[PDB]
Write a new protein. Structure first.
Ligand SMILES: Nc1nc2c(ncn2[C@@H]2O[C@H](COP(=O)(O)OP(=O)(O)OP(=O)(O)O)[C@@H](O)[C@H]2O)c(=O)[nH]1
Ligand SMILES: [Mg+2]
Length: 167
């Protein structure tokens, strides 16, 4: 009944598509096929209401045309990989142009640190928690491989959109 337009953004290879495919199909895509742009719809129950989720899976390095889908989107899943410091530093550039394009400091957003199943972490959990708090947004650790945190990342974004509409 309620439609939510979600956009997954982040650097190349951080796991945007794998996180999206886990939510929708409950399988882990281990092969890496770089995305140009895919979108998916899923009906799911979150906190007792049926939600229609429109999920836009974006490309890491874009060709910019971010603005068109950044204006249509209501919530943004900002994804970095915990073994890629650069992808974590890229987060503030993603948030800056979302804020610019939507012309607001209060945009529904969730910070996602993906690939937490790997033993080669270079971005600490506390680092991300502090960046999240400085933005005033949730932070969720995930692994598309084991599916840990996957529903929570998307559902938490739904709830950030739900709060923004009910301010
Ligand atoms: N170990 C591990 N590998 C992961 C995880 N998530 C993604 N991968 C792998 O990392 C690679 C990149 O994953 P994608 O989901 O395709 O990357 P992306 O962010 O969609 O990348 P672009 O579409 O190119 O922007 C693939 O080989 C995935 O199988 C994870 O949680 N753990
Ligand atoms: Mg992809």
């Amino acid at each position: 009944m309620t439609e939510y337009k979600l956009v997954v953004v982040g650097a190349g290879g951080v796991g945007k598509s794998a996180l999206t495919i886990q939510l929708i199909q409950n399988h882990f895509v281990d092969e890496y096929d770089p995305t140009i742009e895919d979108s998916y719809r899923k009906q799911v129950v979150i906190d007792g209401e049926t939600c229609l989720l429109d999920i836009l899976d974006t490309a890491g390095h874009e060709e910019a045309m971010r603005d068109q889908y950044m204006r249509t989107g209501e919530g943004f899943l900002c994804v970095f990989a915990i073994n890629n410091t650069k992808s974590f530093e890229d987060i503030h550039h993603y948030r800056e142009q979302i804020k610019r394009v939507k012309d607001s400091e209060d945009v529904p957003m969730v910070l996602v640190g993906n690939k937490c199943d790997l033993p080669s972490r270079t971005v600490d959990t506390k680092q991300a928690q502090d960046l999240a708090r400085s933005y005033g947004i949730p932070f969720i650790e995930t692994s598309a491989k084991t599916r840990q945190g996957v529903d929570d990342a998307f559902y938490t974004l739904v709830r950030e959109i739900r709060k923004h509409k009910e301010k």
